[PDB]
UniProtKB/Swiss-Prot annotation, chain A:
This is Protein map. The chain holds residues 158 to 253 of 476 of the full protein. MAP repeats lie at residues 2-97. It comes from Staphylococcus aureus (strain Mu50 / ATCC 700699). The gene is map. It comes from the Bacteria. The lineage of its organism: Bacteria, Bacillati, Bacillota, Bacilli, Bacillales.
From Swiss-Prot, chain B:
Disulfide bonds join C29-C45, C122-C187, C152-C166. Gene3D superfamilies: Trypsin-like serine proteases (2.40.10.10). InterPro entries: Peptidase_S1_PA, Peptidase_S1_PA_chymotrypsin, Peptidase_S1A, Trypsin_dom, TRYPSIN_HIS, TRYPSIN_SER. It comes from Homo sapiens (Human). Inhibited by soybean trypsin inhibitor, benzamidine, the synthetic peptide R13K, Z-Gly-Leu-Phe-CH2Cl, phenylmethylsulfonyl fluoride, 3,4-dichloroisocoumarin, DFP, SBTI and alpha-1-antitrypsin. Inhibited by LPS from P.aeruginosa but not by LPS from S.minnesota. Not inhibited by elastinal, CMK, TLCK, ETDA or leupeptin. (Microbial infection) Inhibited reversibly by S.aureus EapH1. Keywords: Antibiotic, Antimicrobial, Cell membrane, Chemotaxis, Cytoplasm, Disulfide bond, Glycoprotein, Hydrolase, Lysosome, Membrane, Nucleus, Protease, Secreted, Serine protease, Signal, Zymogen. (Microbial infection) Interacts with CASP4; the interaction is promoted by the Td92 surface protein of the periodontal pathogen T.denticola and leads to CASP4 activation. The active site is at H44, D88, S181. The lineage of its organism: Eukaryota, Metazoa, Chordata, Craniata, Vertebrata. This is Cathepsin G.
């Protein structure tokens, strides 16, 4: 019941849309699920699939936290960060392929 | 809108504010009325359900002048290419006709198949973010300069000058930004462009859909 803005850049270009992801308020979710949302909007906004992420030079998303820190996560990697993340700690998400 | 000023209230009565339902969340875009029953916007603003607000200045207040209308149909251009953001144009058929008044009325489209000379001054308006840090509740606007095609050909890998316009001097920090998609680029009071895409940073130049390239399709779809 909270909205978290995200942006998507693919091959240097970024739609000028104001886009949000819906999250349950104050819910701990895993980074496997957060990656699922990220991959979902890459597909629905820009038609980017899993094979496209494998062959890109770099593919990452950055979680910006309300406390001013950030976490940079690699979409080409396995090994989920041993952890869960709270929904109401996220300021925004920047996706970069 | 980056580097702009607040619009005079209701000075741009063709402006449309779109609330879009996506599978994973909500989006927000601009658009513009081109006939009492049709709004023109960007195809990447498509969603399953679209509510359209006309007559607004402060979209976070519920002004008496606003008209709220759902889109009955959202017609993406048949060759819209999501990956490259090509043919990024969409028509929304309103579920009812707007009531015309001083605050709500459509904007002129180009005469036939017009190009756009570099150096031309054009205005863009929108409710998008003003920087990486804050947005706006009221309509803003900024005047930009059409660039020679080389400015975007060096920067954007899929820019096509036949169907897109390169807009915005790099030196000035003036541009459309997140939330401004689908808004009009007006040159002498005619809608020649549609806010489409740019750099993630918002630094100009940016790419607009060239409306004149789509005039036959727009006229056919409305008819």
């Amino acid at each position: 019941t909270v909205q978290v803005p995200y942006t998507i850049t693919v091959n240097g270009t970024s739609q000028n849309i104001l886009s949000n992801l819906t999250f349950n308020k104050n819910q701990n979710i895993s980074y496997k699920d957060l990656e699922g949302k990220v991959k979902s909007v890459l597909e629905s906004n820009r038609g980017i699939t899993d094979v496209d992420l494998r062959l890109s030079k770099q593919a990452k998303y950055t979680v910006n936290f309300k406390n001013g820190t950030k976490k940079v996560i690699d979409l080409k990697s396995g090994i989920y960060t041993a952890n869960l993340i709270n929904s109401s700690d996220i300021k925004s998400i920047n996706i970069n392929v | 809108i980056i580097g702009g000023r607040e619009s005079r209230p209701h000075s741009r009565p063709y402006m449309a504010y779109l609330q879009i339902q996506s599978p994973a969340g909500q989006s927000r875009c601009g658009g513009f009325l081109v006939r009492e029953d049709f709004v023109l916007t960007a195809a990447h603003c498509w969603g399953s359900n679209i509510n359209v607000t006309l007559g607004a200045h402060n979209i976070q207040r519920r002004e008496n002048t606003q008209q709220h209308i759902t889109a009955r149909r959202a017609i993406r251009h048949p060759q819209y290419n999501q990956r490259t953001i090509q043919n990024d144009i969409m028509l929304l058929q309103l579920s009812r006709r707007v009531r015309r008044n001083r605050n709500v009325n459509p904007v002129a489209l180009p005469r036939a198949q017009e190009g756009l000379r570099p150096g031309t001054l054009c205005t863009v308006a929108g409710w998008g973010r003003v920087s990486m840090r804050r947005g706006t509740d009221t309509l803003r606007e900024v005047q930009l300069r059409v660039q020679r095609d080389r400015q975007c050909l060096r920067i954007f890998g899929s820019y096509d000058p036949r169907r897109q316009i390169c807009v915005g001097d790099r030196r000035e920090r003036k541009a459309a930004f997140k939330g401004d998609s689908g808004g009009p680029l007006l040159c002498n009071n005619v809608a020649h462009g549609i806010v489409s895409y740019g750099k993630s940073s918002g630094v100009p130049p940016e790419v607009f859909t060239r409306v004149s390239s789509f005039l036959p399709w727009i006229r056919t779809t409305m008819r």
